[PDB]
Structure 1
């Protein structure tokens, strides 16, 4: 059984796969914040830009099993087109993403990405692992495809993240009332430390979901 906030078809806005058509499956619920505003200031992750509470978004709901969820995901892909790609997010997708769902998505011809905060172990059969560490949470996933660090965060040891086992090391400016400022900080960081590259939230500039 899966609790899903919304499922939608768009381009991946972030990370190395930015620009790529993807079905986004947004699981409800996170382990670093309740999703309630009155809780935000005391939460482990306090900067979240996302509504992951409940199952009331587009295509959202409680799915009986993996086949029902996969059916809805596949249904959003253009008929007769391949390159099927799903980005599992949330919320924290590792609270709910399990092997039977991964196997059913693979059997349906999807490549699978995850967006995860890195505080929970990941399924290594996932094809694309994006880890976005939250400075005040544990980081237990220390290898993956891309480490996409939102900056600035207090308590961050940013340069050290670069010792972890990832193919790409990205900084993503924190959105909120200081986005332009954070974007300038992020560009400068990369130019001074070019192991790192910039991940913009391109979907916000394109005004697409």
Structure 2
């Protein structure tokens, strides 16, 4: 059983795969925030820009098994076209993503990406692992493909993140009332510490889902 907020076909807006066509599968629920506004100020992760509460979005629902979810995912892909790619997100996808879903996605020809806060162990048969550490939460995933850090956060040891085992190290400006401010901070950080690259939320500039 999977509880999914929404499933939609678009371009990956963020990270090293930005611009790439992908089905997004947004799981409902997170382990660092209830998703309720009354709880935000007290949450472990307090800056979230996403609605992940419930199963009422586009193609959202409770899926009885893996095959059912994969059928909905595959159905959104253009007919006759390869390069199938799904981004498992949320919410915190590692609350629900399991080996049977991964195996069924692969069997259907999908490459698999995950967006995870890094507080839960990941399945290493996932093809692309993106970890986005929250400064007040534990980080138990210390290796993957890209480490995408949202900045600024209090209590952050930003330069130390570079000692972890990732292919790409990215900073992403925190969206909110200070986005242009944070974008200037993030550009300056990379230029001073060029191991790091800038990840924009391009879908917000493109105004696409």
Task: Work out the CA distance in 1 between the residues paired with 2:113 and 2:64.
Answer: 22
Deviation at 1:18, TM superposition (A): 0.1
CA distance in structure 2 between the aligned counterparts of 1:50 and 1:8, rounded to whole angstroms = 14
Q: Which runs of 4+ in 1 moved over 6 A?
A: none
TM-superposed deviation, 1:17? 0.1
- Which runs of no fewer than 5 residues in structure 1 stay unpaired? none
Q: Describe the superposition over 1:97-154 as per-residue Cα deviations: whole angstroms up to 9, x where unpaired.
A: 0000000000000000000000000000000000000000000000000000000000
Root-mean-square deviation (CA, aligned residues, Å) is 0.1
* Aligned twin of 2:81: 81
> How is 1:52-201 mapped onto 2 (pairs within 5 angstroms)?
52-201=52-201
SS of 2:125's equivalent in the other structure is coil
Which residue number corresponds to residue 206 of structure 1?
206
Could you tell me which residue of structure 2 aligns to residue 42 of structure 1? Answer: 42
Q: Following TM superposition, by how much is the alpha carbon of 1:70 offset from its aligned partner in structure 2, in angstroms?
A: 0.1
Q: d(CA) in 2 for partners of 1:142 and 1:167?
A: 12
2:185 & 2:56 partners in 1: Cα distance? 36
Shift of 1:22: 0.1
Structure 2 length normalisation: TM-score?
1.00
SS in 2 for 1:146: strand
Secondary structure of 1:35's counterpart equals coil
| Residue deviations 1:48-104 (CA, integer Å, cap 9, x gap) | 000000000000000000000000000000000000000000000000000000000
Write the distance in 1 (CA, Å) between the matches of 2:172 and 2:80.
35
Cα distance in 2, alignment partners of residues 52 and 185 from structure 1: 28
Structure 1 distance, partners of 2:154, 2:17, is 27
Partners in 1 of 2:24 and 2:70 — Cα distance?
Answer: 12
SS of equivalent to 1:51: coil
SS at match of 2:49: coil
1:36 Cα shift? 0.1
- 1:161 is paired with a residue whose SS is helix
Residue 51 of structure 1 is matched in structure 2 by 51
Q: What's the CA shift string for 1:22-59, capped at 9, x where partnerless? A: 00000000000000000000000000000000000000
State the SS of the aligned residue for 1:114.
strand
Distance 2:37 2:126 in 1: 32
Count of residue pairs brought into register by the alignment:
209
Counterpart-to-counterpart distance in 2, 1:160 and 1:194: 14
Rounded to whole Å, the distance in 1 between the matches of 2:44 and 2:85 is 30
Normalising by the residue count of structure 1, what TM-score does the alignment of the two structures yield? Answer: 1.00
